[PDB]
Every structure is written in structure tokens, then in C-alpha cells.
């Protein structure tokens, strides 16, 4: 192509990503070679990612620059991002991330999510390595391959969704319907991860994941989540742990932060705060702009 492969970034099931240079314009890009190798032609994940990204023009959402499609070859050309949240947290593991930057990053991320949700898109794979950071201090949602356009109201969608550590309880307990609330859970976990520099709920299995959540937020019952005891994968034998104090779970956080974080981590998806409502939360009355 007009592209020079600069560096290999990683191989997935979804496919191969290279850092590349436009040899004519100099523009640095990330090239996603889609794993076609294809009994069924173009993968659904590729079709969803392009069709939904072409519709999502926002400062806090990755820019799709171009699609190069032949037979047995499909490349996606994205803006190249210098760093990601996973990497920035590691290089901050001791120092810490300053609270005002945390706040700014969370504000931005909510701005991107609100935009998605208001354009009827569920992300469904939020996690630190999908949250990319550029030199100008912008953080953007990326990797929309597991996303989906959703209906008003919703119907049943795919069950195997969200990485374990960031998976909302309604999905772990196998509810028929899920919606925008599962993305908010994911962000709550990440907010908490920026503060403490450790994964909030690192399960190694579905049950272990529930238990990590319950140990921290309390075991849910009919009181805080009506209908919960009726659910497919709920068991009456679940240990009955008490909700921990948030002052202990996330020490660095002020009153406003705790209040927001607990609203993002409500068990009942109906009580759980929307991206849009969260932007109006007092926690952000003094938020600052993206800066390099």
C-alpha cells in the first residue's frame, strides 16, 4: 500500500494491529488487519465495528480514517494513539495518578459513552487497554467490534459479553435483558482502578467474580435488587456478606467521588446512574479540560 509497517502492536482473535506511516502524507496510523483467513465471508464483528464507528464522530471516540477492502483482505485504518489507560496506570503504580486528571479522564469517558448510548450503541467491552490516550491529553473509547445497535425498548442480546473483571452482575446472573447499565458498571470498576491502581474485582471464574463483588458491595437480596432471588443463576446458599465502607474500598476519594462511584455500582440496573446523569454529578463541578 501507501503504508509503511513501523511496528507490530499485537495479534488477537479479531486480528493483527500494526503501527504504520502513510509514505506520501507522513500521517501515523494504526492498521487493523481483520483475520479473514472465512467460511461466512465478513465477520459480524467487523461489520458492526465499521458501521457503528462510521456513525460516531466524537472527540472521545477513536477516529476510523479509512477501510481498505479487497477479496481475502480487510484493513481498518485508525488514528494512532500514543498510550492507553492500562499502560499509564502501570507507569503510575507508585506515584499515583493525580485526582484532577483521574476526574478529567472519567469526565471524557462518560462524555464518549453518553454519546454512544444517545446514538443507540452499547460498547460491551470497556476496559483499560481499550481506552487510548493521545499526546494532547484526550482519552477515547476504541475497539467497537463487540458493540451493538440497541432498540427502544431492548430485547435479548448476546450473553457472552464483557471481560470478566468488568462484567456487570446482571450478566453474571444471566438476566434476559441488559442495556446501557452494563457499560456504566464497566466504567465504575475502571474509575475505582484509577484511584487504587489495582483491579477492583479480579475474578478467575464467573462464581469467583460474583463473590469478589459480593464481598465488597454486599450480597444482594430482594431488598436492594427486587427480582434477584428469582434469577436463573442466583443460589440461596450464597454467603451473606455486608457492604464494606467506601472510605475503605477507595481511600483517596472525597464525599462526592464515593457518592458517584456507588451510583455507578448499584446492583439493580434501574437504579444505576446513566452516563448523561453522571456528567451532571457534583464530583465534576471543578473538572478541567484535556491538556497535553
Amino acid at each position: 500500500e501507501n503504508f509503511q509497517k513501523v511496528d507490530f502492536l499485537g495479534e488477537g482473535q479479531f486480528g493483527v494491529v500494526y503501527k504504520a506511516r502513510n509514505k506520501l502524507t507522513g500521517e501515523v496510523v494504526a492498521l487493523k488487519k481483520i483475520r479473514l483467513d472465512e467460511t461466512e465471508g465478513v465477520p459480524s464483528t467487523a461489520i458492526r465495528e465499521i458501521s457503528l464507528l462510521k456513525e460516531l464522530n466524537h472527540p472521545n471516540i477513536i477516529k476510523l480514517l479509512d477501510v481498505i477492502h479487497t477479496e481475502n483482505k480487510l484493513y481498518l485504518v485508525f488514528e494512532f494513539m500514543e498510550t492507553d489507560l492500562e499502560v499509564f496506570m502501570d507507569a503510575s503504580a507508585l506515584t499515583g495518578i493525580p485526582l484532577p486528571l483521574i476526574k478529567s479522564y472519567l469526565f471524557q469517558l462518560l462524555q464518549g459513552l453518553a454519546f454512544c448510548h444517545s446514538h443507540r450503541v452499547l460498547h460491551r467491552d470497556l476496559k483499560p487497554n481499550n481506552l487510548l490516550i493521545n499526546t494532547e491529553g484526550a482519552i477515547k473509547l476504541a475497539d467497537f467490534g463487540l458493540a451493538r445497535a440497541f432498540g427502544v425498548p431492548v430485547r435479548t442480546y448476546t450473553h457472552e459479553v464483557v471481560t470478566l473483571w468488568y462484567r456487570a452482575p446482571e450478566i453474571l446472573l444471566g438476566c434476559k435483558y441488559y442495556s446501557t447499565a452494563v457499560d456504566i458498571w464497566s466504567l465504575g470498576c475502571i474509575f475505582a482502578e484509577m484511584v487504587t491502581r489495582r483491579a477492583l474485582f479480579p475474578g478467575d471464574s464467573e462464581i469467583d467474580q460474583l463473590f469478589r463483588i459480593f464481598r465488597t458491595l454486599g450480597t444482594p437480596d430482594e431488598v436492594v435488587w427486587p427480582g434477584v432471588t428469582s434469577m436463573p443463576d442466583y443460589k440461596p446458599s450464597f454467603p451473606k456478606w455486608a457492604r464494606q465502607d467506601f472510605s475503605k474500598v477507595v481511600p483517596p476519594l472525597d464525599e462526592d467521588g464515593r457518592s458517584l462511584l456507588s451510583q455507578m455500582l448499584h446492583y439493580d440496573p434501574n437504579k444505576r446512574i446513566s452516563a448523561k446523569a453522571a456528567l451532571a454529578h457534583p464530583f465534576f463541578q471543578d473538572v478541567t479540560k484535556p491538556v497535553p
Binding site: 467460511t39 465478513v42 459480524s44 462510521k54 477492502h69 443507540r120 445497535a149 427502544v152 448476546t158 442495556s179
Partner: protein, 258 residues
């Protein structure tokens, strides 16, 4: 009432203008006709029933087909191949468990090969520039149904029925936006079953008065009246099942009496 319901509706109203096919496209097609399109869509309804696909998938396929035929000339011998690929793409976009290509070939009866169907997928994607997330009559109907104070399962199925009938006849239904057809459908269903009319709450949400819906209503009334006579019957057949409360068997009203 879910979060962002008014935002999504506003977005859908923007996107339905941009996602519209060229109104007069069949005139400029040398080899195919409204009647041939009808046979295709009707066949696509049967494909949906056999493979237990969502209503939405069928409405998207049709939107893809019409946008494609707006840009490309197709011979009648190849029209079914465009529909197969449109149905494959719609399924990939919307279904949890889309049929595999081998099964799309089976449902055509080996009229085409796995090779042709995959390649036509390629070409449809190019022609649509990968813009597959189109608003449908379906998406507008489900939006409108939330504004029924007493939810009526029979009004809902019938509204869906009428919306599906509009997919068959390019003349006159390409003239109208999905949001207006849906408006027409909902009112006609409501009126038929309960005698009620286009609610004051939907007037506010859409900005469409019963009066502004009259053109589409006069058409849709007619389509409903003559539905037992129509060549294509897969939709009337589908909506006999218990799943849709046998709404296809209801007698329509003689007088709309707006």
C-alpha cells in the same frame, strides 16, 4: 420509558433522511420492476419465518436492497442474489445467531454458489459504504408503543403487520419516511382494534398531527383493504400464527373517519 429515549428518537429522525433510497429508482432500472421487487421481499418474509429471524432483520434487508438498486443496475436473473446478500448482512448486523452462508445458498435452491453470495456481500458493502445501521418502520413502531397507556398486544401486532405490508409495494411507500409510515400504521391499528386515535402524546414526540399523516393513511388503508387480494401473501400468512394474535384475520374499518 428508558434512558435516552428522546435522544435516540431525535437521532433516528436525522438518520432516516440520510438513509432514504432514491424515490424514483425503479423507473431508471432497465430490467426489473415494482412487481419483481414485491416477489423478492415476499420471498424474504418466508426466509425470515423459516430461520426464525427478527422482524428488524427483514426491514434492514429491504432498506439495503432499495439503497443498492438506487445505485446499480441489476438483471432480473441476479435480483435474488442481491436479496440473499442483503439478508446475510442484515442477519450479521442484528441477529445473535445468523444463518451461515451455506444455508442462504440452500434457501435459494442452488440458484447461486457460495462463491457468488460471498462476492455479492463484498459488493453490497462497497455500494452501501458499510452504512448498515439504518432506521426502520420497526424501530419507530417500538418507540411509539411505549406511549400506549394501556399496552394492547393486538394493536402492536397489527401495527407491525401494516408496517410489513408497506415493504412489499415500492409504489407508493418509497415516498414516505419510516417515521410517517409507522405513524400511519400505529393509528390505523389503534383505530381498527379500539376505535382510539393517534395519541396527543405521540403528536408532541413526533410533531406529526393526524392531519399531516393523512396521505400515508389513505394509502395504508387501501393496502389493508386489498391485502387478501394481493398476489404476495407471505405476510398475511405469517400474521395468522398465534405468535401475532391472528391480527391478519381482523376485518379492517371501511371508514377511517379521521
Amino acid at each position: 420509558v428508558p434512558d435516552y429515549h428522546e435522544d435516540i428518537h431525535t437521532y433516528l429522525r436525522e438518520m432516516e433522511v440520510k438513509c432514504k433510497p432514491k424515490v424514483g429508482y425503479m423507473k431508471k432500472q432497465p430490467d426489473i420492476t415494482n412487481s419483481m421487487r414485491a416477489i423478492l421481499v415476499d420471498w424474504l418474509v418466508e426466509v425470515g419465518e423459516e430461520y426464525k429471524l427478527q422482524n428488524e432483520t427483514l426491514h434492514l434487508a429491504v432498506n439495503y436492497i432499495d439503497r443498492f438498486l438506487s445505485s446499480m443496475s441489476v438483471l432480473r436473473g441476479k435480483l435474488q442474489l442481491v436479496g440473499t446478500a442483503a439478508m446475510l448482512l442484515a442477519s450479521k448486523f442484528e441477529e445473535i445467531y445468523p444463518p451461515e452462508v451455506a444455508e442462504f445458498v440452500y434457501i435459494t435452491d442452488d440458484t447461486y454458489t457460495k462463491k457468488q453470495v460471498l462476492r455479492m456481500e463484498h459488493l453490497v458493502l462497497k455500494v452501501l459504504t458499510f452504512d448498515l445501521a439504518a432506521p426502520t418502520v420497526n424501530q419507530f413502531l417500538t418507540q411509539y408503543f411505549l406511549h400506549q397507556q394501556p399496552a394492547n398486544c393486538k394493536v402492536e401486532s397489527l401495527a407491525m403487520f401494516l408496517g410489513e405490508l408497506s415493504l412489499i409495494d415500492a409504489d407508493p411507500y418509497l415516498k414516505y419516511l419510516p417515521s410517517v409510515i409507522a405513524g400511519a400504521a400505529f393509528h390505523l391499528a389503534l383505530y381498527t382494534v379500539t376505535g382510539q386515535s393517534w395519541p396527543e402524546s405521540l403528536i408532541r414526540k413526533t410533531g406529526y398531527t393526524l392531519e399531516s399523516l393523512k396521505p400515508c393513511l389513505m394509502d395504508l388503508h387501501q393496502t389493508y383493504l386489498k391485502a387478501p387480494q394481493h398476489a404476495q401473501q407471505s405476510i398475511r400468512e405469517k400474521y395468522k400464527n398465534s405468535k401475532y394474535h391472528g391480527v391478519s384475520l381482523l376485518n379492517p374499518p371501511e371508514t377511517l373517519n379521521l
